[PDB]
């Protein structure tokens, strides 16, 4: 979604992640600058969560309903859930006392391999940003909080200044890149969610390394008490809970170290008045020795592109031109390639904007002609 | 959770499923009488949902933004799913007209071995109801919607008749036995369901035995397009979602091809004019060769129980009685247990009623005291 920027020394510009911008000033070289991504390299940890269960064997343990207490050896440990209630005693056990008595039931909780959910959260001060400038609509800048200004040495074109207000977008304290362990199956990892969110969630969970799990009665249930035993259930697999609660929420990128944020923008500002031309020694090229490569077609982007074959004389420079229907004399191409020049490797590719109506675009002597839609 | 029902001929009782009745009727021997279980052995299947789907390789196709229109063989098919969207080509693709171009996605999808949630039903003229008459507070009795009265011949007591009007609970239309496939874990199955409910599930679906399966994309979650491709994800295992839902609600029994109720109950209309004491011609027991096997301790269901060793003559007649303080002559005594004889093989346990204070419980001559609570 590239946004053009037409002359003056100095540009401001917001460059959102994902978005292009096309900076262009009267007698300068197009370049397209646009925010690559906005990344940290292996964030801090802050929760484990468990997405399934692992159950030892159960024990349950239970006396008479006016002395025994009962007890059990996971009981006073740590990684278990238990629970104790009514029993519902008499004579027909060996209780001989006839009334409600006492339970336990205990069973050492674990999670399953496979089945985390890891939360990563963002230090403004640990976090890069990639800028990326590039001509005629490559070299690479990188920001931090602490660096955030860069010359570029566009090659043959000149020199960029770019300092880069590193603009942090949500709160990187609410921000939590949520990864999941790499199931077996083809599913999501690592979405971008919210910190108050991802603490209010019922789910076992810990501190990274931790060997035992928090509040895992969240996936355990326990059954109604018959006089010596009281059952004990897994609520299974929470992964398609966590998907569901995720629908919709845009997966964010991993490359290993690297944890990308889908947010946030930067507010650089361009300096552009140490950068030349591609040159102007050229001679023009011949201006009938050309042909269409491909025709003069739409941007997309709200302009006209197109590219010629030059059968003749190697490096010269393009005479492109274009007339509206009516002033056949005067010149309406607003050239965003500023100098089209074909090259001994090839390329000279042409882009303009036109005003609306029948233009004819003129390429040394080769026309074609272009009907700019009006304003939409 | 007993229930007393103190003669005439003719009795009339709801018995509850899990609910036991205790009815004894003067100069008769008290029986109980409890609804044991309501069935219907392996009923119909109405359909069977998918807990975890399983994609087969995505097929991705995708042509141009002007003429050519995207295909694939997973299309036309059963059993797949697809879907199609913008895809935003242009010249860094093989698509030479820049715009918006033509995509499909298509996977075959599949549901993963036990991961079917299957859905019984119920017929009444199918069901069968179990009864279960025994003497003083065993034979069975089966009924069904067709067949609804029986006459038990209680061994050495008599006959019993039974004319137990079938009322169906939960209109067996509502009612849905949900059984899960054995996962090996320990988890519930079978859980009592409403069909409005069960079949109101964004689960896909499908009938006993169909190969392909209804309305797959509850399960699968497409991506945004990138020119080419189009990411399709599985949003996992839906257990725990299912075990979230199905929270509280009790399970349901199986035993193999029986499958419970665990609602419902039946008006029986218990005849008891048939049916003889323990036997009269016994001899009192020697009133002094007693003594306490178990002391007079609470029934819990607001009788009194005690056991007695009679160290003397066998076969007779135990002479129980109590008396409150201020009237040592009169008898307090409601024996619930109406004629206690101590028997060769063992026994003679005897339960009773008594009014609120202190008594004095004398089994021959064996006193022993009891303090009968009032009214709460």
């Given at each position: 979604r590239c946004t053009h920027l037409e002359g003056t020394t100095r540009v401001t510009l917001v460059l959102e992640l994902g978005g292009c911008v096309t900076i262009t000033a009267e007698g300068k070289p197009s370049m397209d600058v646009w925010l690559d991504a906005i990344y940290q390299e292996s964030p801090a940890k802050t929760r484990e969560y468990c997405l399934h269960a692992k159950l030892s064997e159960t024990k349950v343990a239970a006396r008479c309903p006016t002395m025994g207490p009962a007890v059990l050896t996971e009981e006073r440990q740590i990684g278990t859930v238990c629970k104790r209630d009514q029993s519902?005693?008499?004579?027909?056990?060996?209780?001989?006392?006839?009334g409600k008595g006492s339970i336990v039931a205990c069973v050492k909780a674990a999670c399953e391999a496979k089945k985390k959910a890891t939360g990563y959260v963002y230090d403004a001060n640990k976090i890069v940003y990639t800028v990326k400038v590039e001509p005629h609509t490559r070299k690479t800048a990188t920001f931090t909080v602490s660096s955030e200004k860069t010359i570029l040495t566009l090659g043959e074109y000149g020199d960029v200044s770019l300092l880069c207000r590193?603009?942090?977008?949500?709160?990187l304290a609410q921000t939590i890149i949520l990864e999941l362990d790499?199931?077996?199956?083809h599913l999501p990892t690592a979405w971008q969610v919210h910190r108050d969110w991802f603490n209010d969630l019922a789910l076992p969970w810990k501190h990274d390394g931790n060997p035992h799990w928090n509040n895992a009665e969240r996936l355990v249930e326990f059954g109604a008490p018959h006089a010596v035993k009281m059952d004990v259930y897994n609520l299974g697999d929470q992964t398609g809970v966590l998907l569901r609660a995720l629908a919709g929420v845009p997966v964010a990128h991993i490359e290993g170290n690297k944890y990308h944020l889908k947010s946030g923008h930067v507010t650089c500002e361009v300096g552009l008045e140490k950068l030349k031309m591609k040159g102007l020694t050229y001679t023009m090229?011949?201006?009938?020795?050309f042909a269409w490569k491909?025709?003069?077609?739409?941007?997309?982007?709200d302009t006209v592109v197109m590219e010629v074959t030059f059968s003749?004389?190697?490096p010269c420079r393009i005479p492109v031109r274009a007339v509206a229907h009516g002033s056949p004399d005067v010149n309406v191409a607003m050239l965003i390639t500023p100098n089209p020049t074909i090259e001994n490797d090839g390329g000279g590719f042409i882009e303009m904007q036109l005003p609306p109506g029948d233009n004819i675009i003129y390429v040394g002597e080769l026309s074609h002609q272009w009907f700019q839609t009006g304003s939409s």
């Amino acid at each position: 979604r590239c946004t053009h920027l037409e002359g003056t020394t100095r540009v401001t510009l917001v460059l959102e992640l994902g978005g292009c911008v096309t900076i262009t000033a009267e007698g300068k070289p197009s370049m397209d600058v646009w925010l690559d991504a906005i990344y940290q390299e292996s964030p801090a940890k802050t929760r484990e969560y468990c997405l399934h269960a692992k159950l030892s064997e159960t024990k349950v343990a239970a006396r008479c309903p006016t002395m025994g207490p009962a007890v059990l050896t996971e009981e006073r440990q740590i990684g278990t859930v238990c629970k104790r209630d009514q029993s519902d005693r008499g004579w027909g056990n060996h209780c001989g006392l006839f009334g409600k008595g006492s339970i336990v039931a205990c069973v050492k909780a674990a999670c399953e391999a496979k089945k985390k959910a890891t939360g990563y959260v963002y230090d403004a001060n640990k976090i890069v940003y990639t800028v990326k400038v590039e001509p005629h609509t490559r070299k690479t800048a990188t920001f931090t909080v602490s660096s955030e200004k860069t010359i570029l040495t566009l090659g043959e074109y000149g020199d960029v200044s770019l300092l880069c207000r590193v603009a942090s977008g949500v709160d990187l304290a609410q921000t939590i890149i949520l990864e999941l362990d790499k199931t077996a199956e083809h599913l999501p990892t690592a979405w971008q969610v919210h910190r108050d969110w991802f603490n209010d969630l019922a789910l076992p969970w810990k501190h990274d390394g931790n060997p035992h799990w928090n509040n895992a009665e969240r996936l355990v249930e326990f059954g109604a008490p018959h006089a010596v035993k009281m059952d004990v259930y897994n609520l299974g697999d929470q992964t398609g809970v966590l998907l569901r609660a995720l629908a919709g929420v845009p997966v964010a990128h991993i490359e290993g170290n690297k944890y990308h944020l889908k947010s946030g923008h930067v507010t650089c500002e361009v300096g552009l008045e140490k950068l030349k031309m591609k040159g102007l020694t050229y001679t023009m090229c011949d201006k009938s020795k050309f042909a269409w490569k491909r025709t003069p077609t739409d941007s997309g982007h709200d302009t006209v592109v197109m590219e010629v074959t030059f059968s003749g004389s190697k490096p010269c420079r393009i005479p492109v031109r274009a007339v509206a229907h009516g002033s056949p004399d005067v010149n309406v191409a607003m050239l965003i390639t500023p100098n089209p020049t074909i090259e001994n490797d090839g390329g000279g590719f042409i882009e303009m904007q036109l005003p609306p109506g029948d233009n004819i675009i003129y390429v040394g002597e080769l026309s074609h002609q272009w009907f700019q839609t009006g304003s939409s």
